[PDB]
């Protein structure tokens, strides 16, 4: 029954990404080399290369990397997705945010 | 034997043609004290006009 | 080696200006 | 500075004499050497200002790294670019005819440091 | 032999001193630690002192 | 074909080919301070592969030198009895066959990574060979251009605004 | 092991084995690690005995090399690696502390 259940789950819950990856998502993917596996990365703040303030930069870094929240779960990224693909939003097609796994 | 072989033809008349001095075409990553050599090369290439 | 712009004599430009108006180099 | 004992006077004389090695040896010049127009004092100060500006960017990153290997790697990565630019400057200054040419070369080197050097350093430090 | 070239960029050695767990021997007036140094040859003909 | 295509000391036909003489001459015009730790690693792997290779080349050439020395003596095989003439002719001919072998370029993955890499190490090596070894770079530039490599340092560069630093041998555009 | 307590490293027990496993075989830090095993024999399990053993390591490092008063109190990283050699009082202190940590019972 494992095969039948897996086939049903795949057929029911699989849709194509239906969208082009945004600039922010691509930049996050290119910076995912900075993610460290099995041990947390020590994030050091240098105002001349990172800008902003130490608290704001550390909050953004925690949101991007430590929290594990995906780029498509960010509000501004979601707004960009719903804006740059409004043509597909029309004619009754719903955009998929998180790619299927 | 049975493929492309680079040619060995070169410029064999112009004096000091292969004493190439530093420029943006050589990236200036040479031996530090070769700057003197460059000057010499420069002078030589002004002697043969 | 590069000639510095202030020490650069535009001999190529001098010859170019002396070319006829209907010239292949001017077309280039 | 006049009033002092024998030992203090001897120590002051020693400290003064250890700094006049440049003065004593300036008379002994060689005829066969290849002379060049030196980099002017203002250009020296501008180049040192550019270097200090570079050190301003790298300071928090290197002082927040607890491994000597990482700091040495950062030093080596920047030093290759700086050494290429230094070689270009040395060639173009040794082959200089007047002070105008030396100033041009020094200005080009300083502009390279202030324009591309800071960008390269920032990219390296972001990598670290 | 050759010359003392107009400019040399010198890497400051790191970790030569461990007296108080500091690996930066040098610091400029701005307070920023120094990794590099600029050495200039002002006089191109004078001898170098022993 | 082979099960060891991953090996750095291996190569296929269309890899960059450098003879041992060219490789040693190229080594004679480089500095380790100007190379990143990855470039130094490439050069060290090439060093060990090449030390074994230069050790082995006379062994490769020995059968041919033996045959040629035998054919110079005549059509008589005086084994254990013509050894003196055979090995005098060998000490003459084996250097000639080894000359042909050592002047023969051989392809290698390390050769194609050291020269054709697009990072700063590759540019440094290419420019150093271009300036200090003009003839080696002439041959190497011809080979690289023939192999669809497009680098500014090549003499055959149609996109350049500066004239070539050497004679451009004829080739098919 | 001229400075340690046992004639041979096998009498040290599991602590000396862990000290050997900590550093490469040519690293003289192992002996210092062994001294840690000596300092935390009847002290590791006692909550104040562990602090006493760490103080013993600090005193040992101060006695082997010339040290300054704050020098061993401002060490950023107390972790050790295989190629850590007892060239400094900080390295001696770190090796001794690592030996103390590995002293069961």
From TrEMBL, chain A:
It comes from the Eukaryota. This is Uncharacterized protein. It comes from Tetrahymena thermophila (strain SB210). The lineage of its organism: Eukaryota, Sar, Alveolata, Ciliophora, Intramacronucleata. The chain holds residues 125 to 225 of 252 of the full protein.
From TrEMBL, chain B:
The chain holds residues 546 to 594 of 594 of the full protein. This is Ymf68.
TrEMBL record, chain C:
It comes from the Eukaryota. This is Uncharacterized protein. It comes from Tetrahymena thermophila (strain SB210). The chain holds residues 29 to 56 of 222 of the full protein.
Automatic annotation (TrEMBL), chain D:
This is Uncharacterized protein. The chain holds residues 66 to 193 of 193 of the full protein.
């Amino acid at each position: 029954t494992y095969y039948s259940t897996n086939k049903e789950a795949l057929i029911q819950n699989f849709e194509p990404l239906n969208r082009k990856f945004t600039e922010e998502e691509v930049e996050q993917f290119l910076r995912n080399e900075g993610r460290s596996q099995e041990e947390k990365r020590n994030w050091i703040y240098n105002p001349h290369i990172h800008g902003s303030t130490e608290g704001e930069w550390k909050a953004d870094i925690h949101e991007k990397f430590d929290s594990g929240k995906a780029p498509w779960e960010r509000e501004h990224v979601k707004a960009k997705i719903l804006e740059t693909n409004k043509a597909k939003i029309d004619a009754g097609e719903e955009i998929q945010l998180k790619p299927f796994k | 034997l049975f493929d492309f072989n680079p040619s060995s033809i070169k410029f064999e008349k112009y004096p000091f043609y292969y004493w190439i001095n530093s420029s943006q075409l050589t990236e200036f990553n040479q031996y530090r004290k070769f700057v003197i050599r460059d000057s010499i090369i420069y002078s030589l290439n002004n002697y043969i006009i | 080696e590069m000639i510095l712009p202030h020490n650069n004599r535009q001999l190529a430009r001098q010859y170019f200006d002396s070319l006829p108006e209907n010239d292949i180099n001017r077309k280039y | 500075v006049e009033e002092m004992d024998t030992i203090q006077k001897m120590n002051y004389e020693a400290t003064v004499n250890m700094g006049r090695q440049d003065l004593i040896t300036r008379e002994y010049t060689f005829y066969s050497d290849y002379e060049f127009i030196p980099i002017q004092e203002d250009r020296k100060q501008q180049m040192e200002d550019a270097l200090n500006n570079l050190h301003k960017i790298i300071h928090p990153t290197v002082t927040q790294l607890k491994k000597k290997a990482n700091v040495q790697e950062i030093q080596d990565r920047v030093f290759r670019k700086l050494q290429g630019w230094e070689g270009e400057l040395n060639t173009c200054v040794f082959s200089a005819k007047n002070v105008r040419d030396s100033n041009f070369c020094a200005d080009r080197f300083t502009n390279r440091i202030n324009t591309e050097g800071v960008e390269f350093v920032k990219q390296i430090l972001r990598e670290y | 032999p050759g010359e003392v070239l107009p400019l040399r960029i010198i890497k400051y050695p790191l970790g030569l001193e461990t007296i108080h767990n500091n690996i930066f021997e040098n610091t400029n007036n701005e307070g920023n630690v120094e990794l590099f140094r600029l050495r200039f040859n002002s006089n191109s003909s004078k001898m170098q002192h022993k | 074909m082979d099960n060891n295509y991953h090996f750095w000391g291996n190569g296929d036909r269309q890899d960059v080919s450098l003879s041992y003489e060219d490789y040693y001459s190229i080594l004679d015009c480089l500095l380790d301070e100007k190379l990143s730790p990855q470039g130094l690693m490439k050069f060290k792997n090439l060093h060990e592969v090449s030390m074994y290779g230069v050790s082995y080349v006379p062994l490769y050439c020995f059968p041919v030198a033996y045959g040629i020395s035998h054919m110079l003596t005549g059509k008589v095989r005086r084994g254990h009895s013509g050894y003196r003439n055979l090995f005098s002719l060998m000490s003459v001919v084996l250097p000639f066959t080894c000359w042909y072998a050592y002047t023969t370029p051989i392809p290698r993955r390390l050769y194609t990574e050291i020269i054709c890499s697009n990072n700063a190490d590759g540019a440094y090596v290419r420019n150093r060979i271009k300036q200090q070894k003009p003839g080696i770079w002439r041959k190497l530039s011809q080979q690289l251009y023939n192999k669809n490599f497009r680098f500014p340092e090549l003499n055959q560069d149609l996109t350049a605004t500066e004239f070539p630093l050497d004679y451009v041998a004829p080739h098919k555009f | 092991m001229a400075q340690t307590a046992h004639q041979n490293r096998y009498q040290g027990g599991l602590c000396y084995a862990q000290c050997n496993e900590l550093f490469s075989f040519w690293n003289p830090s192992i002996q210092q690690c062994w001294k840690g095993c000596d300092f935390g024999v009847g002290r590791v399990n006692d909550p104040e005995g562990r602090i006493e053993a760490q103080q013993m390591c600090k005193r040992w490092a101060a006695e082997l090399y010339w040290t300054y008063k704050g020098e061993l109190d401002t060490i950023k990283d107390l972790r050790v690696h295989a190629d850590m050699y007892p060239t400094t009082p900080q390295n001696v202190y770190r090796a001794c502390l690592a030996g103390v940590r590995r002293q069961k019972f």
